[PDB]
């Protein structure tokens, strides 16, 4: 029915923002702003689904943002993606348990050694 | 208990005065102390130490004593090192008798002090001791000498970057073996073995192969004399590090040659062509318009500009561009090369710091003490571009042959973690370079994105191999 | 104004077959240009790295599209037998 569509976005809003699901949500989300033809993510429409997507959520999202801008001037790959949430969720304020020699991207770690001296 | 009273109680003493016997050079005051202190149990650490020590820091005075002069100079910093490394390699089986812990310690200071120095500082990396090395082969082989190159031999091995000096080797040896100018073969041969005991086997058959193309084009020139002064080298384009020439227009007196051979190749082999290389091609030619005869030798580029003032006189620059075509750079370095000769010259000092543009012319005076003169000589800037290209090469073989490492170990062990394939990569290629973390790190994005490597759902760091 | 007469010419060339040598036999683009899954995607960092790879027959082929045939066959398409790496 056209209320039961209606009062469909409190409660899936609810229920989507609980974890395991919401892990679900962010990876198709790569596939469904992605076109066919391309492997790689445009950097503006990635700009675009991070400010969208992860609002509020991750902690340094402004200061991230505004990375990748004047430096990374290249598309954004499938990996970086999907371990992006996993260091959202492990970071911590002072972001000394970092390690530079882990299971990160190279993107992640020259950000984190970027984002270092400005705290 | 007089070993203890006597040598013991003194040993602090003994320490000071082993350092002013370094100082000084006392072959038998060091041997006397080394065989009063070998009594002491557990007594030669300090002695080791301060000797590695005092090794290391006469290595660096020594480098640092020729700085300036040694980054263009390969032969004076091999003979640096290599009179230091015999004064203590003497020493040490003089006086320490050979020990296993005084010429570990040798080893140990000079791996130390032959990586890093004042030059390699200079240079900002690593790679420039190879490269040296390289060309003081290059200098000794191309034109009683059998201990040079043993010393060189010794040395090399206390490199840690030895893919450097492979790939300027074969380079140097494929420049000495495309222009006959070399000292003898025995000399190349022993050469040979020597790296066969001391690199792969896969290495020393490169240079095989570049040898047996040099005697298919030997027998190749035979038969093309005996089936007939034209000489020609025929080499495989996938054995060779020689790039394509560019743009350039056949002289018309050199065309008469160039119908007739292709065609014999057509002939002989089907299914193949010959692309000419004009950098690496040189000749003679004879003028008898001056006051005395004269020959001159030059390159393709040189000869094909004088070709055109036969039947001309004074030309431009934006002429001997749209009929010659040389690219500007090329032209302009083969023009100042004539210009330092004064063969075609408006009287300027400056002829090396000259500015050229197209505006202008053959100087007929031109006299000279020998008969037969070699105007040929390498261009100003090239060997930099060259050292350069041949570097951001390595580096990407280098990359390339991580890439592969790591796919090929990720094919024996389905599942790996990471920090068991870091430590298998490192292990793996450590006969030839230490690769760093993230140039390791590089790759596994790369293979991952390539669709070879996969990271399990339940383990962010344990990757496993797809189809 | 003057003569000039050549006594003798040196000169290098490079052999290389000709089927193979003007385009790539796994893909019709041209071996200097970029191979077919390179330029539908050319904004990441494996669309710097697509160069020429060399064999022992001399066979030249794009380093991306040996890579890929490498993966489930072990021959060299034209000749038939083992490739191995020479040169990139
Ligand atoms: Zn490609
Ligand atoms: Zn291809
Ligand atoms: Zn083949």
Same mark, same amino acid.
């Not at chain 1, 992006?84 to 348990?97: R, V």
């Not at chain 1, 050694?113 to 400005?118: G, L, T, V």
């Not at chain 2, 074969?170 to 066969?196: G, P, T």
């Not at chain 2, 062509?273 to 393709?300: D, H, I, P």
């Given at each position: 029915?056209?209320?039961? /569509?209606?009062?469909?976005?409190?409660?899936?809003?609810?229920? =989507?923002?609980?974890? #395991? !699901? &919401? $892990?679900?949500?962010?990876?198709?989300?790569?596939?469904?702003?992605?076109?066919?033809?391309?492997?790689? /993510?445009?950097?503006?429409?990635?700009?675009?689904?991070?400010? =969208?997507?992860?609002? #509020? !959520? &991750? $902690?340094?999202?402004?200061?991230?943002?505004?990375?990748?801008?004047?430096?990374?001037?290249?598309?954004?790959?499938?990996?970086?993606?999907?371990?992006?949430?996993?260091?959202?969720?492990?970071?911590?304020?002072?972001?000394?348990?970092?390690?530079?020699?882990?299971?990160?991207?190279?993107?992640?770690?020259?950000?984190?050694?970027?984002?270092?001296?400005?705290? | 208990?007089?070993?203890?009273?006597?040598?013991?109680?003194?040993?602090?003493?003994?320490?000071?005065?082993?350092?002013?016997?370094?100082?000084?050079?006392?072959?038998?005051?060091?041997?006397?102390?080394?065989?009063?202190?070998?009594?002491?149990?557990?007594?030669?650490?300090?002695?080791?130490?301060?000797?590695?020590?005092?090794?290391?820091?006469?290595?660096?005075?020594?480098?640092?004593?020729?700085?300036?002069?040694?980054?263009?100079?390969?032969?004076?910093?091999?003979?640096?090192?290599?009179?230091?490394?015999?004064?203590?390699?003497?020493?040490?089986?003089?006086?320490?008798?050979?020990?296993?812990?005084?010429?570990?310690?040798?080893?140990?200071?000079?791996?130390?002090?032959?990586?890093?120095?004042?030059?390699?500082?200079?240079?900002?990396?690593?790679?420039?001791?190879?490269?040296?090395?390289?060309?003081?082969?290059?200098?000794?082989?191309?034109?009683?000498?059998?201990?040079?190159?043993?010393?060189?031999?010794?040395?090399?091995?206390?490199?840690?970057?030895?893919?450097?000096?492979?790939?300027?080797?074969?380079?140097?040896?494929?420049?000495?073996?495309?222009?006959?100018?070399?000292?003898?073969?025995?000399?190349?041969?022993?050469?040979?073995?020597?790296?066969?005991?001391?690199?792969?086997?896969?290495?020393?058959?490169?240079?095989?192969?570049?040898?047996?193309?040099?005697?298919?084009?030997?027998?190749?020139?035979?038969?093309?004399?005996?089936?007939?002064?034209?000489?020609?080298?025929?080499?495989?384009?996938?054995?060779?590090?020689?790039?394509?020439?560019?743009?350039?227009?056949?002289?018309?007196?050199?065309?008469?040659?160039?119908?007739?051979?292709?065609?014999?190749?057509?002939?002989?082999?089907?299914?193949?062509?010959?692309?000419?290389?004009?950098?690496?091609?040189?000749?003679?030619?004879?003028?008898?318009?001056?006051?005395?005869?004269?020959?001159?030798?030059?390159?393709?580029?040189?000869?094909?500009?004088?070709?055109?003032?036969?039947?001309?006189?004074?030309?431009?620059?934006?002429?001997?561009?749209?009929?010659?075509?040389?690219?500007?750079?090329?032209?302009?370095?083969?023009?100042?090369?004539?210009?330092?000769?004064?063969?075609?010259?408006?009287?300027?000092?400056?002829?090396?710091?000259?500015?050229?543009?197209?505006?202008?012319?053959?100087?007929?005076?031109?006299?000279?003490?020998?008969?037969?003169?070699?105007?040929?000589?390498?261009?100003?800037?090239?060997?930099?571009?060259?050292?350069?290209?041949?570097?951001?090469?390595?580096?990407?073989?280098?990359?390339?042959?991580?890439?592969?490492?790591?796919?090929?170990?990720?094919?024996?062990?389905?599942?790996?973690?990471?920090?068991?394939?870091?430590?298998?990569?490192?292990?793996?290629?450590?006969?030839?370079?230490?690769?760093?973390?993230?140039?390791?790190?590089?790759?596994?994005?790369?293979?991952?994105?390539?669709?070879?490597?996969?990271?399990?759902?339940?383990?962010?760091?344990?990757?496993?191999?797809?189809? | 104004?003057?003569?000039?007469?050549?006594?003798?010419?040196?000169?290098?060339?490079?052999?290389?077959?000709?089927?193979?040598?003007?385009?790539?036999?796994?893909?019709?683009?041209?071996?200097?240009?970029?191979?077919?899954?390179?330029?539908?995607?050319?904004?990441?960092?494996?669309?710097?790295?697509?160069?020429?790879?060399?064999?022992?027959?001399?066979?030249?082929?794009?380093?991306?599209?040996?890579?890929?045939?490498?993966?489930?066959?072990?021959?060299?398409?034209?000749?038939?037998?083992?490739?191995?790496?020479?040169?990139?």
């Amino acid at each position: 029915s056209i209320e039961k /569509l209606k009062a469909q976005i409190p409660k899936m809003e609810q229920e =989507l923002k609980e974890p #395991g !699901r &919401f $892990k679900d949500f962010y990876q198709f989300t790569f596939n469904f702003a992605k076109n066919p033809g391309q492997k790689g /993510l445009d950097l503006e429409m990635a700009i675009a689904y991070w400010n =969208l997507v992860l609002n #509020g !959520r &991750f $902690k340094f999202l402004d200061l991230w943002n505004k990375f990748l801008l004047e430096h990374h001037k290249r598309s954004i790959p499938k990996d970086t993606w999907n371990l992006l949430l996993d260091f959202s969720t492990m970071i911590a304020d002072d972001m000394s348990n970092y390690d530079e020699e882990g299971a990160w991207p190279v993107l992640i770690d020259d950000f984190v050694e970027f984002a270092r001296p400005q705290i | 208990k007089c070993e203890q009273v006597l040598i013991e109680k003194h040993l602090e003493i003994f320490h000071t005065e082993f350092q002013n016997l370094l100082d000084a050079d006392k072959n038998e005051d060091l041997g006397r102390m080394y065989n009063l202190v070998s009594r002491i149990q557990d007594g030669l650490g300090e002695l080791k130490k301060l000797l590695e020590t005092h090794i290391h820091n006469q290595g660096l005075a020594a480098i640092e004593k020729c700085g300036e002069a040694a980054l263009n100079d390969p032969k004076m910093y091999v003979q640096t090192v290599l009179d230091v490394h015999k004064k203590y390699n003497a020493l040490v089986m003089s006086a320490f008798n050979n020990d296993a812990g005084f010429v570990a310690a040798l080893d140990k200071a000079c791996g130390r002090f032959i990586n890093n120095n004042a030059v390699t500082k200079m240079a900002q990396s690593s790679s420039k001791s190879p490269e040296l090395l390289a060309r003081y082969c290059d200098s000794l082989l191309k034109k009683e000498l059998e201990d040079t190159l043993n010393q060189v031999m010794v040395v090399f091995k206390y490199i840690e970057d030895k893919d450097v000096f492979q790939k300027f080797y074969a380079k140097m040896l494929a420049k000495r073996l495309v222009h006959q100018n070399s000292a003898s073969d025995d000399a190349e041969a022993s050469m040979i073995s020597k790296l066969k005991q001391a690199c792969g086997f896969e290495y020393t058959s490169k240079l095989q192969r570049m040898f047996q193309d040099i005697g298919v084009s030997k027998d190749l020139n035979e038969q093309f004399k005996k089936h007939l002064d034209f000489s020609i080298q025929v080499l495989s384009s996938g054995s060779w590090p020689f790039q394509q020439s560019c743009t350039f227009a056949l002289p018309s007196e050199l065309e008469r040659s160039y119908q007739r051979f292709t065609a014999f190749y057509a002939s002989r082999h089907s299914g193949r062509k010959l692309t000419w290389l004009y950098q690496l091609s040189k000749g003679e030619l004879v003028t008898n318009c001056f006051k005395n005869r004269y020959t001159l030798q030059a390159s393709t580029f040189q000869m094909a500009i004088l070709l055109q003032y036969n039947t001309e006189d004074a030309y431009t620059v934006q002429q001997l561009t749209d009929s010659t075509q040389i690219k500007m750079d090329i032209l302009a370095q083969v023009l100042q090369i004539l210009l330092k000769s004064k063969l075609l010259v408006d009287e300027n000092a400056n002829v090396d710091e000259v500015e050229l543009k197209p505006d202008t012319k053959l100087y007929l005076g031109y006299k000279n003490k020998k008969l037969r003169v070699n105007i040929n000589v390498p261009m100003k800037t090239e060997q930099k571009q060259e050292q350069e290209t041949t570097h951001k090469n390595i580096e990407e073989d280098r990359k390339l042959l991580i890439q592969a490492a790591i796919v090929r170990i990720m094919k024996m062990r389905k599942v790996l973690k990471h920090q068991q394939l870091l430590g298998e990569v490192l292990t793996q290629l450590s006969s030839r370079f230490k690769p760093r973390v993230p140039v390791i790190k590089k790759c596994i994005d790369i293979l991952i994105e390539k669709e070879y490597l996969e990271r399990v759902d339940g383990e962010k760091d344990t990757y496993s191999y797809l189809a | 104004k003057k003569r000039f007469e050549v006594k003798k010419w040196n000169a290098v060339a490079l052999w290389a077959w000709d089927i193979v040598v003007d385009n790539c036999a796994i893909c019709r683009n041209h071996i200097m240009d970029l191979c077919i899954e390179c330029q539908a995607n050319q904004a990441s960092a494996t669309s710097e790295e697509c160069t020429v790879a060399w064999g022992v027959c001399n066979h030249a082929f794009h380093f991306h599209c040996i890579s890929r045939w490498l993966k489930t066959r072990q021959v060299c398409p034209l000749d038939n037998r083992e490739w191995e790496f020479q040169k990139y």
